[PDB]
Design a binder for this molecule. Structure first.
Ligand SMILES: [K+]
Ligand SMILES: [K+]
Ligand SMILES: [K+]
Ligand SMILES: [K+]
Ligand SMILES: [K+]
Ligand SMILES: [K+]
Ligand SMILES: [K+]
Ligand SMILES: [Mg+2]
Ligand SMILES: [Mg+2]
Ligand SMILES: [Mg+2]
Ligand SMILES: [Mg+2]
Ligand SMILES: [Mg+2]
Ligand SMILES: [Mg+2]
Ligand SMILES: [Mg+2]
Ligand SMILES: [Mg+2]
Ligand SMILES: [Mg+2]
Ligand SMILES: [Mg+2]
Ligand SMILES: [Mg+2]
Ligand SMILES: [Mg+2]
Ligand SMILES: [Mg+2]
Ligand SMILES: [Mg+2]
Ligand SMILES: [Mg+2]
Ligand SMILES: [Mg+2]
Ligand SMILES: [Mg+2]
Ligand SMILES: [Mg+2]
Ligand SMILES: [Mg+2]
Ligand SMILES: [Mg+2]
Ligand SMILES: [Mg+2]
Ligand SMILES: [Mg+2]
Ligand SMILES: [Mg+2]
Ligand SMILES: [Mg+2]
Lengths: 208, 191, 117
RNA sequence: AUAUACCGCCAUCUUCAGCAAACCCUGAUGAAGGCUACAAAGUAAGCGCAAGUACCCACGUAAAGACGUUAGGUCAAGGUGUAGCCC
RNA sequence: GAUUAACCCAAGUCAAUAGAAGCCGGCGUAAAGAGUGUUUUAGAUCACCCCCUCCCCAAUAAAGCUAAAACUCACCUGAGUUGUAAAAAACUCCAGUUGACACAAAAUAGACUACGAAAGUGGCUUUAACAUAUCUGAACACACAAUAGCUAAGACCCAAACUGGGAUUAGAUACCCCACUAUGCUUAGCCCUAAACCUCAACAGUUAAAUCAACAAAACUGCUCGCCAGAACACUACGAGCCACAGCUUAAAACUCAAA
């Protein structure tokens, strides 16, 4: 890195700065007087102080980016969010006053809930015991569960099974499926859970 | 191996074709329902047939499971099935000494009496120049010691890029064995 | 009290047969052994087997097993932090009687003298 | 012809940190070995690392990288020892 | 090899052969303390003087006994039990609980360090019982001597060569799993071997001088017996002895090497 170890990462949060002094603790007061003496890295060209900034969608966009083509990756993301919203506005107007209350029309709420419904709670990692590697049901850290949900969704949409369907239509359809606990990405989660359950007897092989 | 034992409370498949202790067909049902039936009737679940696409399981008592297992072992003890043919491999050299070829020839004979398949490979000896016709003569030498006991299951065929030969030997079938005895007797009558 | 060593080794003057046959001289070294890491074992299996039990009974539907699923995640979170807590205390020596490095510097000052000076 | 005679210029460990003159001491003056900082026989020039310099910073990247290891590569860069050819 | 020069001896030179100098040194690991103890004829001065570990702890022989764990049988329950890195084979008059029940083996104590010549000896009881009022001493004898093995008659839980089966492997006459026998036990006779090694002989004495090749378990003195003398051939050949007949004890030489 061209930043010396002395450079600290920037904290981009307006609220963190407008917070009154009285509310601050003696520890939080020390951190603030310390940062005035520290070197701060330049803000990356991705995240800003915008109120419409979503780190999850920004991350999902980077996992869809091919060869540094962020403009295209961003275009696909915003096209997917519009396709989700239009599909819900169509389901909303065609529904009865009672069903309308249960219909979500926010694509950000659908996007987040769709991914949370695909996160695998348990994982399988190879473990060496007695000179033999064994697949073993193991807990997954929170970072890993979020990554797998994204990677599985993107992988499913890139599958060749879809013929001539554009990504914003594929991804929009898969998100709404997972939003309702359906589709092939949820099945992939159930498979990993079934494989973890059938290897329950092999749990002891883990040493942590 | 597949054993005739209680499958347990955990059934691998979601949809299960079930039968009654008396053989009555209960149809297809979810594994959760089967677990309720096992507790309701206090019976254990066994797997009768697995090849069928809808998994076939049967409810049975502990005594019944034993009686079935007793039947099966008598069927085998009385009518034992032949085991799968075990393949024994030998890798020889063209310049193999004659004492070591007799040792391995005696070993091949014991494999043929046990009705095994003997895959014999012959490679070119170290720092030796040999032709495929000379390497193929060793096979005949090995099979000449077993006149009416062994024959070629697969005939000598170049392999490994033509560097080595390879044949498969087997024990003569009962029909082929009676034929050898017949032909041998005819020669005796002629002589 | 340390077991006796009188008449235990094969030596000139000792009539009896040897009691002990040490492969190494019974002389104190100037160092102690290094702290031997304890064999690792799987943890949180109890909570892991309750979550997988509910899945088995509810067709692997997470909606019915929310309470057990959260319990398994809490156990791993607590155990994950336990990895950091133990490691910190293990290096600090909070639980150890003394650290082999600390205990060996002390023996360096009082080395065993099996020879005459 | 000989890289198994070599110079020259290099690969490689090296994405290493060691090498070592001259002394001193231990082992009964054997091959050998030489540290403990609340210190117990080592002192060590030099070389390398490092430091400096180049590029956009003190960062990073370059460059640098000893002694040796593989008779490693190259007699066909050029030069050259030895042997050989000269209608 | 020839050649040049030099070197040694010299009417000689020096190729082969033979001879001439053959023991006061050793024995933890280099060859060597012979598996163990005990005589005679003798040897030693360690015997009179002059003195301090008698008894008990796991010596030995005999007879009797049994706490834990097995096996077997029975009743009641279960459908499986066994096997593990993982399988297969094996059993299914099987497994679990309870009760009854050895001619097998002897947790803990034992962190003790004893007994016995050594080999060996560690459940309980009882009987008998553990040589020598100098020392050394029998390979010419006598009596012993782990384990394995032989002969005969018995017992039989468990283990287990061999053998059979399963697996592995290029092969697997193995290592891994299962079954089972000789054998391990008793009685009566044999056999007489171990890395029978604590590889350190017995008795008496010393801790100063040179402490002392190395390592190991510090270095020595007196005295005695036993043993050793390059490697390999060779725990072999032959002879002899032996209840040993594919055995044991004693034990060479030729050829070979410049090391071991
Ligand atoms: K060179
Ligand atoms: K050149
Ligand atoms: K040249
Ligand atoms: K006992
Ligand atoms: K004990
Ligand atoms: K002996
Ligand atoms: K020994
Ligand atoms: Mg194979
Ligand atoms: Mg040792
Ligand atoms: Mg070279
Ligand atoms: Mg570079
Ligand atoms: Mg540098
Ligand atoms: Mg070369
Ligand atoms: Mg090369
Ligand atoms: Mg010796
Ligand atoms: Mg002795
Ligand atoms: Mg004697
Ligand atoms: Mg005597
Ligand atoms: Mg004996
Ligand atoms: Mg016997
Ligand atoms: Mg047995
Ligand atoms: Mg028996
Ligand atoms: Mg007994
Ligand atoms: Mg012994
Ligand atoms: Mg001896
Ligand atoms: Mg003696
Ligand atoms: Mg003495
Ligand atoms: Mg000799
Ligand atoms: Mg012998
Ligand atoms: Mg003999
Ligand atoms: Mg003889």
């Amino acid at each position: 890195s061209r930043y010396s170890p002395e450079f600290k990462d920037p904290l981009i949060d307006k609220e963190y700065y407008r917070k009154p002094v009285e509310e601050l603790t003696e520890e939080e007061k020390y951190v603030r007087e310390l940062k005035k003496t520290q070197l701060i890295k330049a803000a990356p060209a991705g995240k800003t102080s915008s109120v419409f900034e979503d780190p999850v969608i920004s991350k999902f966009t980077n996992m869809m980016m091919i060869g540094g083509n962020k403009v295209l990756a961003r275009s696909l993301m915003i096209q997917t969010l519009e396709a989700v919203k239009r599909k819900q506005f169509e389901k909303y107007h065609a529904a009865s006053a009672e069903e309308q209350a249960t219909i979500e029309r926010n694509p950000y709420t659908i996007f987040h809930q769709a991914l949370k419904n695909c996160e695998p709670m348990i994982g399988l990692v190879p473990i060496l015991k007695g000179g033999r590697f064994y697949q073993v049901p193991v807990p997954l850290p929170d970072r890993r569960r979020r990554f797998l949900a994204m990677k599985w969704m993107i992988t499913e949409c890139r599958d060749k099974k879809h013929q001539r369907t554009l990504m914003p239509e594929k991804l929009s359809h898969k998100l709404l499926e997972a939003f309702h606990n359906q589709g092939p990405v949820i099945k992939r989660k159930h498979d990993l859970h079934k494989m973890a359950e059938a290897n329950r007897a092999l749990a002891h092989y883990r040493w942590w | 191996k597949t054993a005739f034992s209680n499958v347990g409370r955990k059934i691998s498949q979601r949809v299960i074709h079930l039968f009654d202790e008396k053989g009555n067909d209960l149809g297809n049902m979810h594994r959760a329902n089967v677990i309720r039936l096992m507790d309701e009737r206090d019976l254990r679940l066994v797997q009768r047939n697995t090849s069928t696409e809808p998994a076939e399981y049967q409810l049975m008592t502990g005594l019944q499971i034993l009686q079935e297992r007793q039947r099966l072992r008598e069927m085998e003890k009385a009518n034992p099935k032949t085991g799968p043919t075990l393949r024994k491999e030998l890798i020889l050299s063209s310049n193999i000494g004659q004492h070591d070829l007799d040792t391995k020839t005696k070993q091949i004979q014991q494999w043929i009496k046990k009705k095994h398949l003997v895959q014999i490979t012959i490679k070119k000896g170290k720092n030796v120049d040999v032709s495929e016709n000379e390497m193929e003569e060793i096979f005949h030498q090995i099979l000449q010691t077993m006149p009416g006991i062994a024959t070629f299951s697969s005939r000598p065929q170049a392999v490994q890029g033509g560097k080595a030969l390879m044949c498969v030997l087997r024990a003569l079938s009962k029909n082929e064995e009676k034929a050898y005895k017949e032909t041998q007797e005819t020669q005796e009558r002629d002589t | 009290a340390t077991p006796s060593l009188r008449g235990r080794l094969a030596r000139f003057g000792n009539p009896r047969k040897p009691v002990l046959k040490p492969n190494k001289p019974l002389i104190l070294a100037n160092r102690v052994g290094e702290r031997r890491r304890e064999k690792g074992e799987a943890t949180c299996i109890t909570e892991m087997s309750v979550m997988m039990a509910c899945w088995k009974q509810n067709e692997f539907r997470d909606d019915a097993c929310r309470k057990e699923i959260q319990g398994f995640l809490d156990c791993a979170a607590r155990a994950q932090e336990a990895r950091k807590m133990r490691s910190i205390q293990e290096t600090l020596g909070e639980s150890g009687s003394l650290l082999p490095n600390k205990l060996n510097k002390l023996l360096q000052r009082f080395p065993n003298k099996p020879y005459l000076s």
